[PDB]
Structure formats: structure tokens, C-alpha cells
DNA sequence: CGCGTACGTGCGTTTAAGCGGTGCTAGAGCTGTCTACGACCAATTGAGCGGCCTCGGCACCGGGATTCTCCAGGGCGGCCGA
């Protein structure tokens with residue numbers, strides 16, 4: 001599909017003597033997957049600012065990052081003054097809530113409802129955190145969304161962000177079936193999925209003991225995908241974290257139920273997919 | 289109103305009820321003898337019943353513990369549908 005045409009801006013590599021840690025703005029953070037991947041790659045983080053509403057996700061971040069995260073409330077409360085007073089950013093990330101962007105809803109409300117239009121909030125903060133002309137600072141940005149969108153919606157998003165959406169499927173690097181569009185200007189945006197041997201490709205490596213995988217991988221019949229003691233059992237939450245690439249026992253931070261952990265892990269990013277995406281940032285920024 | 293199961297019908301098979309015989313004998317049934325067991329009569333007396341009394345066991349008011357009843361809330365999926 002060639003509807004628009006624009007070259008991706010490739011920044012020159014900075015040497016090690018002018019190497020600086022990253023300043024990261026994370027708009028729709030949720031479960032703090034971005035800072036988790038950044039800490040796993042061994043990258044020094046000078047400032048991480050997450051604008052999260054949901055208190056369970058804020059609790060996930062406060063437990064798993066120990067007060068490193070600077071919290072904002074709603075993204076509508078962020079102005080241009082808040083962007084220009086919190087220093088210039090080096091990495092902007094986010095994925096808008098796809099309640100009305102997904103075409104799996106028969107009665108979907110579209111891009112221009114209060115769940116979808118938050119994307120434009122992103123664009124506004126994309127417009128504020130972007131450096132002006134004449135500044136050769138390497139500025140990188142990343143937007144995530146689902147594959148189940150309309151043609152006009154994806155076309156308008158691609159025109160607004162001015163980048164080619166690469167499609168990445170979790171089955172090439174992890175044990176999940178979800179294809180996601182990624183807008184951004186990272187180097188090697190469409191390079192193939194370098195599967196890490198430490199990543200759990202099959203489903204059975206993500207299971208616990210005493211459980212047999214019925215399928216080869218899981219999706220995002222009135223049965224259950226795991227047999228347990230010759231009985232079909234629901235897929236566990238820690239096993240869901242191992243499928244989604246998270247560390248073991250990650251989203252157990254408060255007194256939330258099983259349904260809350262499902263709602264948090266469903267909306268979260270895939271750790272291996274991000275690790276692939278954030279990989280070339282290591283040569284552009286600080287290392288630890 | 290739907291599921292099923294288990295009962296009724298029919299046919300073949302066969303077990304034994306019924307009828308017809310006789311032989312025998314334990315026992316129902318009738319007869320004579322008498323004896324011992326109960327009705328009938330009087331005296332007597334002591335046990336049982338009318339009357340009384342007093343008192344303690346039962347009925348009853350009140351209070352607290354308790355003991356079951358029931359509904360409100362908190363968490364919990366869960367179920368969608370707008």
C-alpha cells in the first residue's frame with residue numbers, strides 16, 4: 001500500500017565522548033513496559049515521565065521501578081509549558097487505547113471519540129517535545145496500535161505522524177498471536193525479527209510445572225488452551241507475563257483481582273517486540 | 289414439554305396347581321364318673337372413701353443470655369449491549 005511517500009529521517013551516530021543518558025516521555029504507559037525494556041537493555045535513564053491515569057498501572061510502576069517514574073495524571077492536563085519546563089526529551093513513546101479504534105467492535109465509535117482522540121493528544125505532545133529547526137539532537141518517537149483498524153483510520157494516522165507503519169507480529173519472537181502497527185523513526189524500523197535465544201518462542205517454555213500446552217501459541221471452541229492434570233484450565237497470569245515477555249511475577253503489585261491483571265496485561269506492550277525496537281538506541285545513547 | 293425407562297402386551301416355554309384316586313391315623317367330638325371348685329349365707333372387721341388442711345410443686349411476671357432468622361454490604365466474576 002503506497003498512498004503516501006516520505007523518506008525516514010536518519011540521524012547521524014554520536015560518538016562515545018558526547019554520549020548522554022536518555023530522557024523519556026511515555027504518554028500512555030500503563031504497565032511500564034518501556035522503562036522495563038530500557039533497564040533490561042542496560043541504558044542509563046536520566047528522566048522518565050509517565051502520564052498515566054489508572055491507579056493500578058501507577059502501582060505497577062511504583063513497585064517495579066522504585067520512584068524513578070515521574071507521574072503525571074491525565075494527558076489532557078499536560079500543556080506546552082509542562083513539556084518545555086521538564087527538559088528536552090530524547091524518546092517519546094505511547095500506544096493509544098483501542099476501545100474505538102479496533103474494528104472488532106460492531107458498534108465502534110471511531111477515531112474521533114474520547115478513547116481514540118487521545119491519539120491527537122499524543123500528536124500535540126509530539127508537537128511540543130519535537131525540537132525546532134537547526135537542532136541536530138537525535139529525537140526519536142514511537143506510536144503503537146492494533147492491526148484491526150480501518151483503511152481510512154490507518155491512512156489518517158500515517159499521514160498525521162508522517163511515517164510508515166511497520167507491522168510486527170508477536171509470534172515471530174514470542175508465544176503470542178498479535179500483530180501491531182508501529183509508527184516511528186527508529187533506525188532499522190523494518191529490519192527482520194532477530195529472535196533471541198533467551199526469549200521464549202514456544203508456549204510450553206512459558207508454562208509452569210504440571211501443565212501441557214494444547215496449542216503452539218496463544219491468541220490475544222468452549223475449551224481452554226492448557227491441560228492441567230488431564231483437565232482444561234485457564235491460562236495463568238504469570239504464564240501470561242511469560243508469554244508477553246515480562247519478568248516472572250511482574251504484575252502482582254497490589255490487591256487486584258484476576259480480571260484486573262487481565263485488563264492490565266492485555267493492553268500492555270510485548271517486551272521482546274519492544275526490545276527489538278529499542279535495540280539500536282544502545283549505540284546512540286548511554287550504556288550501563 | 290421433553291427424556292427415558294420401565295411396565296404391559298404377546299408368544300413360547302415349563303412349572304406346578306388342580307382333580308382324582310386310596311390309606312391311614314391323629315385328633316375332633318360325644319358319653320359316663322365324680323370331685324373339687326365356686327355360688328350362696330352370716331359375722332366381722334379393717335381397708336377404702338368422704339371431709340379437711342397445709343404447703344410445696346406448679347403457674348406466672350420480669351431480666352438477661354442466647355439462639356436462630358434474615359437482610360445489608362463487600363467482594364466477586366460475568367455478562368454483555370449500548
Ligand SMILES: Nc1ncnc2c1ncn2[C@@H]1O[C@H](CSCC[C@H](N)C(=O)O)[C@@H](O)[C@H]1O
Pocket residue numbers: 027028029030031033051052053054057073074075076094095096097098118144267268269
Ligand atoms: N486519557 C488518558 N491519559 C493517559 N492514560 C490513559 C488515559 N486514558 C486511559 N489511559 C490509560 O492509559 C493506557 C492506554 S491503553 C494501551 C497501553 C499501552 N499499549 C502499554 O504499553 O501498556 C490504559 O491502561 C488506560 O488505563
